[PDB]
Amino acid sequence: KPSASNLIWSDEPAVVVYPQEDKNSEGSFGKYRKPASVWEAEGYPIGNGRVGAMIFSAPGRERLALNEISLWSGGANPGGGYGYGPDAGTNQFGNYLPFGDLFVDFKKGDQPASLSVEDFTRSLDLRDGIHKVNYKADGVTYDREAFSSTPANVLVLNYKASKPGQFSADFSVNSQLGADISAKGSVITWKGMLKNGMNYEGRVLIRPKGGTLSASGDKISVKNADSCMVVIAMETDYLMDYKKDWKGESPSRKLDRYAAKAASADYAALKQAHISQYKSMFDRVKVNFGKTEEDVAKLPTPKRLEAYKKNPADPDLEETMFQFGRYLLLSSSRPGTLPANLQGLWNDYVKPPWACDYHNNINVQMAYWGAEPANLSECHEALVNYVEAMAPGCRDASQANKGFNTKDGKPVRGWTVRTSQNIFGGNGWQWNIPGAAWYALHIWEHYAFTGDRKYLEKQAYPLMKEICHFWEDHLKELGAGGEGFKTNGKDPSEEEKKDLADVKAGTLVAPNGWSPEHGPREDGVMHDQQLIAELFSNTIKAARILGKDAAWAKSLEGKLKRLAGNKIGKEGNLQEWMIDRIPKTDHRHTSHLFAVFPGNQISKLKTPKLAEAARLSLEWRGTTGDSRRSWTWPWRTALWARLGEGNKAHEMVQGLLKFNTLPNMLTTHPPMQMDGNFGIVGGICEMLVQSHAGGLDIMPSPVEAWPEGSVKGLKARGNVTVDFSWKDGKVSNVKLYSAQPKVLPVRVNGKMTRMKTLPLK
């Protein structure tokens, strides 16, 4: 009986193909059309935040498509273009790249291993972070395991069998980048230098027990061994420091310190240390949404998802999706290394969709939506450390932009970003002028959730203040009744000016904005205003907590009160623009609901009239086929959840799974984009616990699809850990934990109580 949840698995061997089209036979793709389509749907991913693999296991062959998170082309990209590809140099944007592949060709004796196998399963077990294969052939049971170890800092593979002397295979490395590959002794080494100067090296260290080991050509063969452990180690000379030209130690010198040592350890010891580190992160949150029918829970994941599409009743599969988002984030994001990109850290493409980059118009943010509420707070440090380290490049691009110059012709203070960023301070494509303000929301929430004052004073507040200065420089002043307002460059019409009537003098608006991704270009679009008000408000809070810059903070509190704010339109919707344009639209985006989520300005508790207007706006967006994207479902999940529509929020979870999830549970835009996986964690957390509206609010509205369940380990602002259960329409067993004894207002079961915390075990 395969576990009903936290296990992704298939009874079908993976399709194994080379990422280079020309390297594959006529029908090697099975039901797919191209190697990329195979890769995104068939692979199971492992990672330790820095190195990872997408694993394609079959009885005859096995492909590990390999990644190290810093392998990037491109560079400073001073012209702001969006050119990429593996040969992109310092004057271009560049892209995340594939590191290599390990191919394993299994043999029986000296002939190919048979595919006449029995009881084949390949599985990604989320409970221990291990990819597992198991099958039977000719009375012999074979087992494979693979994981990405944080303590050992390598990928570890292990092949075993029920009888001695049964393991034979040929190991080979594939590169799409022209790497130089050579085998010697028991190690395959591959290395290269990108056109932008980045050096990289990988090593595959083969460690059989028994049998023979020979190195012919650049392949390595193992014959008639008992078992075989493999270590895969990979490094670049990337260093996240612009003052060092982004260059640190050579990759060979890094690998010399640890790879051989890891390959010399005992497999059982490597495995135990991995599982222990892994559970220390994964086990922080446990949820139960209900019990799926045993006949449905027995289905392999591809068939279970096809079944879900026709009858979406599978709370255990939804629990798996939720935990997969946590698994993917902890596997792609750690404090000392780069943040998760559009695909986490997994990529097979030399020219990936959207450069597999850092998109700050929603994607990178959504990637971190689960970091704080789902108890993976240290993962969020990777994002903030990145933002700090890329800022000198953003200041360069922002100062070079004469369009940002103040009225005195001086360059702007602070910085903002273009829509895309690489790992060298480069910015690409359209300016995303409020994007740094949105970064500042993550910078503040890391403090709101942890209470880490050192973080706030040393890292967060200096960034926030600089982003504020940019807006103190770029905001535009309006006269009474909208005097000065521009829309698409022209003055407002007489009908338009009727909306502009109540605008007091000195009103501050972001000039010439765009509500993402439709309409006109005009002053004070509500998306911009909300992002700025959130930036100013949180920076002001930070200053007073740190007792710093009191004068400028009260100065800012005045500009905050002068910003154009939210308006309820004549039809009752929340306005998306200063002008009262019709809310009936199918448009995908709901950019003026930022203030409901992920922002903090509109809540049911604190601003009921604005919330009901927001709820009408979202209702009138409807749900059409074009509103189906990897990133719409999780945002609408969180929105509906915060607006008290639990059932609507659950319908968005179902929609993600029905329409935008691949057979391996990776979300797809299309093509594959992990924002959905990452973001649905945040959306589901808001269905269970809210802490943005003045205190803890536990399951504020029911979810009929989850009549009975429980959670342990969710995080709330102020660094509180939350456990509870629910059954019928009642929440019970509410228990709050903190490090310091506190007393808190708690809304639960429709009543506002006050409870004290228990100490954090």
Numbering used by the authors: 25 to 785
What text appears in the publication on this structure?
We discover FucOB from the mucin-degrading bacteria Akkermansia muciniphila as an α-1,2-fucosidase able to hydrolyze Type I, Type II, Type III and Type V H antigens to obtain the afucosylated Bombay phenotype in vitro. FucOB displays α-1,2-L-fucosidase activity and showed no activity against α-1,3, α-1,4, and α-1,6 fucosylated oligosaccharides. FucOB as well as other members of the GH95 family follow a single displacement inverting catalytic mechanism.
The high quality of the electron density maps allowed the trace of residues 25–785. The (α/α)6 helical barrel of FucOB displays a deep groove where the active site is located, mainly flanked by solvent-exposed and flexible loops, including loop 25 (α7−α8; residues 357–386), loop 28 (α9−α10; residues 429–458), loop 33 (β19–α13; residues 547–550), loop 35 (α14−α15; residues 587–614); loop 37 (α16−α17; residues 651-655), loop 39 (α18−α19; residues 683–699) and α-helix 8 (residues 387–392). A first glycerol molecule is deeply buried into a pocket defined by W378, H383, W655, and H693. The O1, O2, and O3 atoms interact with the side chains of H693, R612, and H613, respectively. The crystal packing analysis of FucOB and FucOBE541A structures reveals a strong π–π stacking interaction between W453 with two prolines residues, P765 and P783, of the neighbor protomer. Consequently, this protomer restricts the entrance of the substrate into the active site, supporting the inability to obtain a complex crystal form.
